[PDB]
């Protein structure tokens, strides 16, 4: 049977290309297929939409994202196909092989050959497509892994009724280019243009917020009798166009990023709607001006620290950015963009004593505050495993940026800016 093509917009080359490598005749379709495109390019959405328009096909959907390593990936193929064949052909008396016995790719070929023999009495060769969404998204991945799936079909008995027509999707480009000489039939997705992103969210997210709880409470509160669902869509649609124009340079040409600001700012945007905001979005924009002027993606006196604590951090930044050459020149009475350098603990205490407002000395409280900063992670150490502070080889560095320390010195009345 021939394949009907879907109507997916902004992908009207791939939806027609897959009519080539996917067909009811297993003697035509290739043994490997790659769909390549970045995140938010619709590869998962396009492939699933096409399959749901042709129910006569038989396919298995898996996700390497959940299948953390390759061992689950092999096992899921064996397990799902074993179930899927039963679902397709319940009348055939068949036996079972344990899908948990898969340890190496050879065993998959062994198990698959054993399974396919049971279906030798089938009327016709059966074309089967195995689908993995985001192949290169696998958490533990290597170059040699993909070659293991490319040449798998020809190790099967070529007279077998069941043919495994693998399907893969890839995100990156530095991964796919290593396999260019194989000339695997490839269909491509580029990044979406600004115009398409605006239209996609208009078509997708309009119906989502037309029926949210927040507005229909406010509409009754504002007693909007003339409101209609056609107005309801355009009211929500205006929010998408404004937020895109406001934050396209912020988010990018991304659909995932925009789909969250449309969520957070929406209740606050809902609040400013009144009886006078029904018909003029310009006034509604004026009321909600402060929403757009800030991203509000931020999660929200920034650091409650003791007097001893404040001078401890101030002294450390000097150590991490001033050369040891200048320690005697500046403090004795005798680079903002670079990453901080390491320093020794003796350097910190000497400078801390040197600038503290006769000597301050180092009691338990000074060390008690110093260790807390390490616990608070405002100062880092040179280790990651089995932290031992008293080991002499560990060094220290500053984890606090310049802007925070600027405001700390203000509450201290210590003029750091004159030391550089």
């Amino acid at each position: 049977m021939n394949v009907t093509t879907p109507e997916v917009a902004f992908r009207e080359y791939q939806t027609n290309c897959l009519a080539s490598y996917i067909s009811a005749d297993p003697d035509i379709t290739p043994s490997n297929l790659i769909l390549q495109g970045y995140s938010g390019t619709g590869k998962t959405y396009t492939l699933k939409k096409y399959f749901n328009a042709n129910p006569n096909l038989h396919a298995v959907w898996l996700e390497p994202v959940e299948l953390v390593s390759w061992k689950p990936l092999l096992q899921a193929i064996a397990r799902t196909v074993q179930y899927k064949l039963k679902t397709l052909y319940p009348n055939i008396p068949t036996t079972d092989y344990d899908p948990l016995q898969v340890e190496e790719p050879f065993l998959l070929v062994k198990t698959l050959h054993n399974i396919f023999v049971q279906y030798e009495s089938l009327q016709e060769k059966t074309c089967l497509f195995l689908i993995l969404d985001g192949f290169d998204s696998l958490q533990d991945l290597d170059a040699a892994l993909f070659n293991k799936y490319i040449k798998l079909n020809e190790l099967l008995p070529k007279d077998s009724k069941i043919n495994i027509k693998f399907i893969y999707t890839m995100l990156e480009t530095s991964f796919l280019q290593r396999y260019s000489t194989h000339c695997i039939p490839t269909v491509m997705f580029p990044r979406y243009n600004v115009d398409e992103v605006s239209t996609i969210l208009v078509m997708s997210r309009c119906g989502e917020l037309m029926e949210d709880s927040c507005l229909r409470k406010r509409i009754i509160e504002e007693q909007i009798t003339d409101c209609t669902d056609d107005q309801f869509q355009n009211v929500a649609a205006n929010f998408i166009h404004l937020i895109v124009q406001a934050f396209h340079s912020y988010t990018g040409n991304d659909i995932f990023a925009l789909n969250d600001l449309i969520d957070f700012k929406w209740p606050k945007y809902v609040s400013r709607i009144t009886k006078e905001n029904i018909f003029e979005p310009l006034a509604l924009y004026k009321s909600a001006i402060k929403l757009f002027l800030s991203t509000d993606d931020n999660l929200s006196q920034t650091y409650d620290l003791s007097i001893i604590s404040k001078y401890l951090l101030i002294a450390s930044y000097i150590c991490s950015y001033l050369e040891p050459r200048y320690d005697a020149s500046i403090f004795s009475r005798k680079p903002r963009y670079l990453q901080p350098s390491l320093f020794a603990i003796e350097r910190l205490l000497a400078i801390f004593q040197a600038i503290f407002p006769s000597l301050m000395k180092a009691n338990i409280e000074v060390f008690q505050n110093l260790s807390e900063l390490h616990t608070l992670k405002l100062i880092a150490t040179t280790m990651n495993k089995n932290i031992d502070y008293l080991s002499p080889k560990v060094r220290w560095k500053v984890n606090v940026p310049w802007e925070i320390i600027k405001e700390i010195s203000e509450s201290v009345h210590f003029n750091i800016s004159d030391y550089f």
């Binding site: 530095s174 280019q177 290593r178 260019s180 000489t181």
Partner: protein
């Protein structure tokens, strides 16, 4: 050697790549060359010729495929395919870094036989 019989039958892309690499070797006085330098010298050697229509057609076929309107590739067409083909045949040895323009391309074959094949 029988290797030269296969060298002489390579596509134009392979011959140009090998010739540019050899010229960069003779300029640098070293064998391995930075991968970005190779694709820069390819453009240098392509455009050092005159603006004659034959040169223009060759350059358009090489860099932007000679397509109708869609164009402006940063590197020549099949620049990866022929690189892998030389790499997978054992002639060309390259180290692995995901940064394209800091990896070194190194030859396995003798210094003389490449020129000998190119001189044929």
């Amino acid at each position: 050697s029988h290797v030269i019989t296969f060298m002489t039958r390579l596509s134009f892309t392979a011959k140009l790549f090998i010739y540019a690499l050899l010229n960069l070797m003779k300029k640098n006085g070293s064998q391995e060359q930075e991968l970005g330098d190779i694709v820069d010298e390819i453009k240098l050697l392509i455009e050092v010729n005159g603006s004659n229509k034959f040169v223009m057609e060759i350059a358009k076929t090489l860099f932007q495929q000679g397509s109708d309107n869609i164009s402006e590739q940063l590197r020549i067409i099949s620049w990866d395919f022929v690189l892998n083909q030389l790499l997978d045949a054992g002639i060309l040895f390259k180290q692995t870094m995901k940064n394209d323009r800091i990896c070194c391309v190194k030859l396995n074959i003798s210094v003389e036989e490449a020129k000998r094949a190119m001189n044929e």
